[PDB]
Design a binder for this molecule. Structure first.
Ligand code: MG
Ligand code: MG
Ligand code: MG
Ligand code: MG
Ligand code: MG
Ligand code: MG
Ligand code: MG
Ligand code: MG
Ligand code: MG
Ligand code: MG
Ligand code: MG
Ligand code: MG
Ligand code: MG
Ligand code: MG
Ligand code: MG
Ligand code: MG
Ligand code: MG
Ligand code: MG
Ligand code: MG
Ligand code: MG
Ligand code: MG
Ligand code: MG
Ligand code: MG
Ligand code: MG
Ligand code: MG
Ligand code: MG
Ligand code: MG
Ligand code: MG
Ligand code: MG
Ligand code: MG
Ligand code: MG
Ligand code: MG
Ligand code: MG
Ligand code: MG
Ligand code: MG
Ligand code: MG
Ligand code: MG
Ligand code: MG
Ligand code: MG
Ligand code: MG
Ligand code: MG
Ligand code: MG
Ligand code: MG
Ligand code: MG
Ligand code: MG
Ligand code: MG
Ligand code: MG
Ligand code: MG
Ligand code: MG
Ligand code: MG
Ligand code: MG
Ligand code: MG
Ligand code: MG
Ligand code: MG
Ligand code: MG
Ligand code: ZN
Lengths: 105, 68, 208, 157
RNA sequence: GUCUACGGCCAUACCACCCUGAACGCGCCCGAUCUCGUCUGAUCUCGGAAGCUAAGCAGGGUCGGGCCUGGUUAGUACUUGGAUGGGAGACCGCCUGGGAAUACCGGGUGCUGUAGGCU
RNA sequence: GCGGACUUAGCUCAGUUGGGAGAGCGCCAGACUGAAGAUCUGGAGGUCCUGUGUUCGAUCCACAGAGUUCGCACCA
RNA sequence: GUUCGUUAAAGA
RNA sequence: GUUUCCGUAGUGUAGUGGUUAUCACGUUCGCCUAACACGCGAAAGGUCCCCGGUUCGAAACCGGGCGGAAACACCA
RNA sequence: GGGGAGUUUGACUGGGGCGGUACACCUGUCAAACGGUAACGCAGGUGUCCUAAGGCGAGCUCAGGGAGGACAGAAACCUCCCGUGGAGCAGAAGGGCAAAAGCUCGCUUGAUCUUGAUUUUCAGUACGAAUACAGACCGUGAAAGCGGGGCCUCACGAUCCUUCUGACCUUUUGGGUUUUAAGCAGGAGGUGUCAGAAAAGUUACCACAGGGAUAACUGGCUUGUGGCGGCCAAGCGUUCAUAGCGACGUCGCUUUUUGAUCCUUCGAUGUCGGCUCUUCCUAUCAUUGUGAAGCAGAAUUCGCCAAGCGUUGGAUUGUUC
RNA sequence: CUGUUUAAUUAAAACAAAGCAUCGCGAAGGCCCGCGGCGGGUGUUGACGCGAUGUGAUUUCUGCCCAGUGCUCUGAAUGUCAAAGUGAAGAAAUUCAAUGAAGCGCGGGUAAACGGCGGGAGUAACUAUGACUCUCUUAAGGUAGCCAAAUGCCUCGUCAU
RNA sequence: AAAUGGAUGGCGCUGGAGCGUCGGGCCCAUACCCGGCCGUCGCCGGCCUACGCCGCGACGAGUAGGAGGGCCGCUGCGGU
RNA sequence: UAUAGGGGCGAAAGACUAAUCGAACCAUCUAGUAGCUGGUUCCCUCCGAAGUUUCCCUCAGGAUAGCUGGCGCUCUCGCCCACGCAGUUUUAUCCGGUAAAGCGAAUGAUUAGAGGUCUUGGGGCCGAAACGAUCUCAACCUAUUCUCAAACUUUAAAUGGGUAAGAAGCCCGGCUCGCUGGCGUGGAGCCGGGGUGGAAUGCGAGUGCCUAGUGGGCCACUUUUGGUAAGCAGAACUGGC
């Protein structure tokens, strides 16, 4: 689908509709020495083999695209998330379309 | 190993073993679900009824006892 | 060709040729008039029709064989252009076939028990007219003998009736010769137009 | 296995019958819906917002809540276990009044007027609604003509 | 006996054709400088008032088409409950109750609220 | 998900310490020849995968993306 | 210091 | 019988990421050759199996038939 | 790194396997005029698409057809008229829609944040979806009002763990500062067997507990199929329908074939064929008595009473055939 | 060929066999046992030996393919690649960067290694069959031989005895 | 037209012991009415083991299952 | 004499290893576990089912709900009128889309004849040729006519479903509201008072806790799905086993 760069959405800090820079949410690299990561390393270390189950039967091909909304106004810097339904292709912020144009394939 | 899947046979006879009961009685009906602006009306109206109904209804009771 | 002992009196809902069938072959009968097709109304006075008694299904191949036998007896009796036969019944119900052995048990059990469209039959109500033959006044016995020869070929028990009406129209033969000349009925080919009195006056001005 | 979604059997029920396809009349809106009013439910295909469900069509309920452009109705719905009073939010276009309660209030007002007349004039009025009585020994008239003889007709095909 | 503005009932009030319309009123009409928007004052806005009921509109008519209502169809097709009723079956008949529709024929075609003006 | 490689003429390849197009096989038109092959001359055909940024100027600089391939690791 | 295939019976 | 795949000039095919009739052969015409084969320049030959639906537009996307090609039809 | 060790080989199924998903969600019918209501029932779908195809306001009316207008032809563009959904509304259908929910134009993200209630499957649990509200910030419009996604009916996901966002939040263990870690609330990563285990095959060397809930023999219901009859007769029979036949239709019988179901049998009914041996039926091959022929005789054919008696020896194949 | 085999359902077309070959190993080694040791079998042994394999006397033969799965060789020439080590940021936990042993890939070899060996149409003075020729395709396209075989569904193939 | 020899149950039945329409009687089931007895339940009586004694009325079937009673029974323990 | 159990040995049959070998024997864990067969011990009295919804790697099982039993509690009657309930009817009020019927009514099929002249396509005549005139045919239109539709419908049954048939209901007067707003306007709540004889029939009602079994069904009239049909498979109401 297509979303624009800027969007004037309600941010919870100042309590008004302010414009938001919309970026794609990166999944994020996992951090070492988390609770479940230390528990999984302690449980995995030793002659036990694979302890917790590993997922194999993947069936969904798409992911829910979520948007990082940042407040454009200075010294607010409020960030939050907005979820969209599942889509295969996702344009970032450009290539708007028009009706009266010739096709010219 | 095919079995009988779904039926509603011998069900109304089980229903009428106990005489299917209407709720049939709620004196001073339940109040939740009604409009919150109407509730903001009604609660303040009830507590000011508790506050200021005394003297005017008392004088009206005196007046109606004097008349009839 | 399965026998007509396995396709008989009505048991299923009517399943006609429509958007949902899409696999029915062509019916056996295509034409319905065999006699003088361009005949007028005043040419053949009387008519005899064939009334069903049993609520049954009649097959298109039986209708084919019966119209061939009736046409042959009519052209032997009163010759060409001496009669007008019309098969009132039209086939629309489509039967289904669940064929097997396609001498082994190893093809399919009752796994998918839905039938392919085999043939076309026609559901007949009690009292519904199968065939109607209009002829001259002197051909009274020949229509009776033709429908008698068709009776042995149609299944079930059915009767015959020489109609009180003047041919295929719904008007009486007694009132026909007294009423088509004065006011109302005008011949329209083999059919008869009935004009009411609630018309525009220009039709009455064009008449008379 | 019937895939029980929402309105899976409503090819005819939520449709406008004949010579009625178009905009809604305004007398459907211009009505007085207060609390305690006994109302009926009749689905409309024009407004696709607040139709209740395919189960509540033709049923009769009691109004408990009224809002800007809808209403709240409690309906006794029968299920497998027992009948239940259920709180539904239905728009105004799907709801009409019920004339049975209005006829009962007319009968109550007539009974009150007859009771006031009874207290005034000392007349026992029999204000209970008795059912259809058996016919009394009335008297017939056959003057001028003999009773017409009828016999069944022969069978003619 | 009417019209205009807003309507409620949504074809008893739509469509085709032909006549009538005195006084208000409705309109067609006379032109773009400002408000206005178009290729075009054709549409929408702006200040009218030289004519006209030709048209819109209001009435009447058509052995008019449709709509509604009433007979016929018809106690007929169907149908709740019943039988050690018939029939090989297909179905059909009877007791008790309820009871539909088309061709055919006849009749109508607007009723009203609020506010305002003409005989 | 990480790291890395190849995207160019109809086809196969070349080309940074960047001033931008070449070789061969294909094609066309001539010459040579009694005629073909080889040979010689002269033209045609590159959207250099796409977009953005540096630069006076990006096929060769950097980033992102799109097809193909090579390993690597797997608590959703 | 490359390639040129088929050319009937005879020809009195 | 069940499940997949195919149907395009006289032949085998390419080609849809919906919008040509594409390639070699087969035939015809003309040139060179004493004359053939070969070679060259063209021309002709299409219902893209048939009928419907989708769209501005179908052979293509889909459905129903037809004619074919593969795999299975096992345990008693 | 099957040299060795442990574990698994989904479920539905007219026996199992193969085929398919009827395993999750929709449309119409089955569905018997409230609603619910089955099958490996029927016909069709879905795991997407849309920064507009959302919301508002304004303007216009669609598909088709008639008549015209150079090149313009059946289809290029313009105008006049008729035009009730016969077009379009993203896709499979159903419902609904005309100064519109359709087409075009102008702004805008209400596809925003937050707490409750109700409907839907339902056990009146959850998820998903939806409805009426309430409180903020808003968009559009002159205002009325409308909008917290798609005109409605589906288009989607639990615990635990990870990641991200928020409070100038809490705890980081005897007291302070900082980093880190844990928690609170809500978005995502996914359980398609779709209320969710992480999973290949063979056993004719097989074993155990059970089942006729469940097949392979017979027997039982049915006769599609096989076999054997009848009905009307267009025709074959040189002429001539019925001496013998009989197309097209149609009504039956049998379990000598095969098919369908699973009713009995799984703590066993020993499963093909042959040899030998006894009885029975007639739908009669012959013999006894008969009728009809296109019966000259002979030899045949068609029927009736009729099962009393016969109905072979062999080459082949395990053969039934 | 002699021999052996399912004692208590098989005696064989099964196993073994001499012959033909192939591969590993020069002893700090090849193939193995062992929970353990520089402990043991081969080994009181040294390529005419030991260990593991396919086929199975004699005669005549050993067709063609490394595309795939294996096996083997080579170059830190080059991608990827874990501990340990080096450097930088900080108060440190921690983070980042290059450095890159085996293996995989890149390159070569090998089929008496596992294995594999094609379907189309037109063509000769009767018809047929059809060497020849065009074309898709693979890594190679079944060669010498043999046959309805113990191997052929149709099939009780056809002909002769 | 079907295989063992057999089925309106058989025997037989023709002025019916067949067929269709019916009249008057006759026979019975644990069905119905009256009555005797037991038990359960409901209501109630009495200052005669009150956990006993009477009174009236209606009903008693039942696998899985659930309750109440047993002055049914066996073994042992303390009172008696 | 040596090789001892996942080991040994095997001219290889998975054959032999003390009558047992595709993993010997004895003891222990161990009374291993089993949703799977079989059995489960005295009497009488009273009440008394189900094979169904949903969920589960669920289909021989389990959880939940339903059906059932036991234990009670709160009341009501016995001394012109009571509280309330119903597998029921009636009086009013709505709801539906099946049976039927229709398609000279929308959609889909489908039959035959008649009339008309706009139009192109195929034959023939007047004849250099000409919408210059005309015969014939096709298509179209008009008014008819034949037969239907589980996934068609203008109309529309019978049967069936909901609601009301009063003291919790009417009427009058007055306060409060931060809801709403021309208005003491509207709407809700609160307070006081007046009259209870408001369809038929039958019945004395409400309510709390705990829990077994059940989760394989079958048959019959009527309405039906698939199949040729079945003592076949699958549904609806009621009744029985
Ligand atoms: Mg480790
Ligand atoms: Mg069950
Ligand atoms: Mg329906
Ligand atoms: Mg201007
Ligand atoms: Mg301007
Ligand atoms: Mg003007
Ligand atoms: Mg006029
Ligand atoms: Mg006018
Ligand atoms: Mg008029
Ligand atoms: Mg009229
Ligand atoms: Mg009936
Ligand atoms: Mg030659
Ligand atoms: Mg293993
Ligand atoms: Mg299974
Ligand atoms: Mg119903
Ligand atoms: Mg229903
Ligand atoms: Mg118009
Ligand atoms: Mg639609
Ligand atoms: Mg529609
Ligand atoms: Mg609008
Ligand atoms: Mg709000
Ligand atoms: Mg599940
Ligand atoms: Mg064997
Ligand atoms: Mg047969
Ligand atoms: Mg069984
Ligand atoms: Mg069986
Ligand atoms: Mg069964
Ligand atoms: Mg025996
Ligand atoms: Mg004998
Ligand atoms: Mg032996
Ligand atoms: Mg040899
Ligand atoms: Mg060694
Ligand atoms: Mg070889
Ligand atoms: Mg290689
Ligand atoms: Mg030849
Ligand atoms: Mg060969
Ligand atoms: Mg006898
Ligand atoms: Mg008698
Ligand atoms: Mg008892
Ligand atoms: Mg062996
Ligand atoms: Mg073996
Ligand atoms: Mg032994
Ligand atoms: Mg074993
Ligand atoms: Mg062991
Ligand atoms: Mg035990
Ligand atoms: Mg044990
Ligand atoms: Mg289950
Ligand atoms: Mg059992
Ligand atoms: Mg339970
Ligand atoms: Mg209870
Ligand atoms: Mg109880
Ligand atoms: Mg019908
Ligand atoms: Mg229990
Ligand atoms: Mg059944
Ligand atoms: Mg019984
Ligand atoms: Zn902000």
């Amino acid at each position: 689908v297509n979303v624009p760069k800027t969007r004037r959405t309600f941010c919870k800090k100042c309590g008004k509709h302010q414009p938001h820079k919309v970026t794609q949410y990166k999944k994020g690299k996992d951090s070492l020495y988390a609770q479940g990561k230390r528990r999984y390393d302690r449980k995995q270390s030793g002659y036990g083999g694979q302890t917790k189950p590993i997922f194999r039967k993947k069936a969904k091909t798409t992911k829910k695209i979520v948007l990082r909304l940042e407040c454009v106004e200075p010294n607010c810097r409020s960030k939050r998330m907005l979820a969209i339904k599942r889509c295969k292709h996702f344009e970032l912020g450009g290539d708007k379309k028009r009706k009266g144009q010739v096709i010219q394939f | 190993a095919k079995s009988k899947n779904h039926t509603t046979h011998n069900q109304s006879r089980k229903w009428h073993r106990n005489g299917i009961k209407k709720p049939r009685s709620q004196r001073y009906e339940s109040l939740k679900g009604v409009d919150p602006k109407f509730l903001r009306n009604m609660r303040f109206a009830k507590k000011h009824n508790k506050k200021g109904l005394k003297k005017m209804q008392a004088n009206n009771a005196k007046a109606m006892s004097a008349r009839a | 060709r399965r026998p007509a002992r396995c396709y008989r009196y009505c048991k299923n809902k009517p399943y006609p040729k429509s958007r949902f069938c899409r696999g029915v072959p062509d019916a056996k009968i295509r034409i319905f008039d065999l006699g003088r097709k361009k005949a007028k109304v005043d040419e053949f006075p009387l008519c005899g029709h064939m009334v069903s008694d049993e609520y049954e299904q009649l097959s298109s191949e039986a209708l084919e064989a019966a119209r061939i036998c009736a046409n042959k007896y009519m052209v032997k009796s009163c010759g060409k252009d001496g009669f007008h036969i019309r098969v009132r019944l039209h086939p629309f119900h489509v039967i289904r076939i669940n064929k097997m052995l396609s001498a082994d048990r190893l093809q399919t059990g009752m796994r998918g028990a839905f039938g392919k469209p085999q043939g076309t039959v026609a559901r007949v109500h009690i009292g519904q007219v199968i065939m109607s033959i209009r002829t001259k006044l002197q051909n009274k016995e020949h229509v009776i003998e033709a429908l008698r020869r068709a009776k042995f070929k149609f299944p079930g028990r059915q009767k015959i009736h020489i109609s009180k009406k003047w041919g295929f129209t719904k008007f009486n033969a007694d009132e026909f010769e007294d009423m088509v000349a004065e006011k109302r009925l005008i011949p329209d080919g083999c059919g008869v137009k009935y004009i009411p009195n609630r018309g525009p006056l220009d039709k009455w001005r064009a008449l008379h | 296995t019937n895939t029980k979604g929402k309105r899976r059997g409503t090819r005819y029920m939520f449709s406008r019958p004949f010579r009625k396809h178009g905009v809604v009349p305004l007398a459907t809106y211009m009505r007085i819906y207060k609390k305690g009013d006994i109302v009926d439910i009749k689905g409309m295909g024009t407004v696709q917002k607040g139709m209740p469900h395919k189960c509540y069509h033709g049923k009769t309920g009691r109004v408990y809540n009224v809002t800007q452009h809808a209403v709240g109705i409690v309906v006794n719905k029968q299920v497998k276990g027992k009948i239940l009073a259920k709180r539904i939010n239905v728009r105004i276009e799907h709801i009409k009044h019920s004339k049975s309660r209005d006829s009962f209030l007319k009968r109550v007002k007539e009974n009150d007027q007859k009771k006031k007349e009874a207290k005034e004039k000392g007349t026992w009025v029999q204000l209970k609604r008795q059912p259809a009585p058996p016919r009394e020994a009335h008297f017939v008239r056959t003057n001028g003509k003999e009773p017409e003889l009828l016999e069944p007709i022969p069978y003619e095909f």
